[PDB]
Write a protein that binds this DNA or RNA. Structure first.
Ligand SMILES: Nc1ncnc2c1ncn2[C@H]1C[C@H](O)[C@@H](COP(=O)(O)CP(=O)(O)OP(=O)(O)O)O1
Ligand SMILES: [Mn+2]
Ligand SMILES: [Mn+2]
Ligand SMILES: [Mn+2]
Ligand SMILES: [Mn+2]
Ligand code: NA
Length: 313
DNA sequence: GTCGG
DNA sequence: GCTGATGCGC
DNA sequence: CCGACCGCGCATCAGC
């Protein structure tokens, strides 16, 4: 809230570069700037003050100067008013509609939610589900509901087999008071880096009607929809489940706890210490080093350990 | 769009 | 009917 | 001043 007007501005520019310009590196540049400014403990008075921060450069400092002077950004004003930009931006809020589908739709005059309904036969399964739950998927999930969801998943998992271990990661594990979705990391002793495990868990969650819909499902990843049992229905929620080798659990939990900016910052700092981190391993790239805890990974790269609650960048 | 090389 | 190409979310 | 900034699992379909 300290520099919220600035970070909101940079976030809206990011979304434009992602959805309309299809410029993913600019999208990420804007987000890294919004992130670093969010962390800045002073109220920003000038573009030059902001330019001191790593990731804020010449062009953002200028935009910051204009925002500070006028209270707005002319570039954003023009985008908002541009029918094609505005429509593409909008359509990409449907899960399953990305920059390419959005732009194709808009070129054919499909431009609003109603139009998508009028044309559901042009949508694939994922997009039809995105449309069906459009409002629900933009609602946040209160931590109290996440706690009930956790209990359902952790118990139904234990029903299928007691050696399974499910861990809710993402913003929940970082202790956020609300979450955009539910991210679940799954392990079983029989699946290691050598050695239907996911399908058994998915189908049970379907059996007790927690999982309502499927977006994508394979041997190691499930993307779908779930809903707490009900009164007014609870909203339908996005749920992601990943099955990962048990001996790669801690790299996995580190990664899927995030945040995504934190992961970016860690993989870059890793390189600055001779290491390379991914979702599965940490390597000097040579053999995967041994890991028994998240802190093991912090140690290797000489960072002070950070509890999950301190990785929300 | 930014920054280290 | 198959599959390389690519989109999507992450 | 110029390139790196992750790369992958899963679904779809244009082009044979
Ligand atoms: N592009 C990316 N680069 C690096 N790491 C990435 C990533 N996308 C996702 N991740 C990682 C970190 C997230 O915390 C985690 C879950 O990704 P997520 O898409 O569920 C976002 P989350 O952090 O859970 O907040 P929320 O909005 O859902 O409440 O997976
Ligand atoms: Mn999440
Ligand atoms: Mn989300
Ligand atoms: Mn997720
Ligand atoms: Mn990857
Ligand atoms: Na979308």
């Amino acid at each position: 809230t300290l520099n919220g007007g600035i970070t909101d501005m940079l976030t809206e520019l990011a979304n434009f570069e992602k959805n309309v310009s299809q410029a993913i590196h600019k999208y990420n540049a804007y987000r890294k700037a919004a992130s670093v400014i969010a962390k800045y403990p002073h109220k920003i008075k000038s573009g030059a003050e902001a330019k001191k921060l790593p990731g804020v450069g010449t062009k953002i400092a200028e935009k910051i100067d204009e925002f500070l002077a006028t209270g707005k950004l002319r570039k954003l004003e023009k985008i908002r008013q541009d029918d094609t930009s505005s429509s593409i931006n909008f359509l990409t809020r449907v899960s399953g509609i990305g920059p390419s589908a959005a732009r194709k739709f808009v070129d054919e005059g499909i431009k609003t939610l109603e139009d998508l309904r009028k044309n559901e036969d042009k949508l694939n399964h994922h997009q039809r589900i995105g449309l069906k739950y459009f409002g629900d998927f933009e609602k946040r999930i209160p931590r109290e509901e996440m706690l009930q969801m956790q209990d359902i998943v952790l118990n139904e998992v234990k029903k299928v087999d007691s050696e399974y271990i499910a861990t809710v990661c993402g913003s929940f594990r970082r202790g956020a008071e609300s979450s955009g979705d539910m991210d679940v990391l799954l392990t079983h002793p029989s699946f290691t880096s050598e050695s239907k495990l996911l399908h058994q868990v998915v189908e049970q969650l379907q059996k007790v009607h927690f999982i309502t819909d499927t977006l994508s499902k394979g041997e190691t990843k499930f993307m779908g929809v779930c809903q707490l049992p009900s009164e007014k229905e609870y909203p339908h929620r996005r749920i992601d489940i990943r099955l990962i080798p048990k001996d790669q659990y801690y790299c996995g939990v580190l990664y899927f706890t995030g945040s995504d900016i934190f992961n970016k910052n860690m993989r870059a700092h890793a390189l600055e210490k001779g290491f390379t981190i991914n979702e599965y391993t940490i390597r000097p790239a040579g053999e995967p080093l041994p890991v028994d805890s998240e802190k093991d990974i912090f140690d290797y790269i000489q960072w002070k350990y950070r509890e999950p609650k301190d990785r929300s960048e």
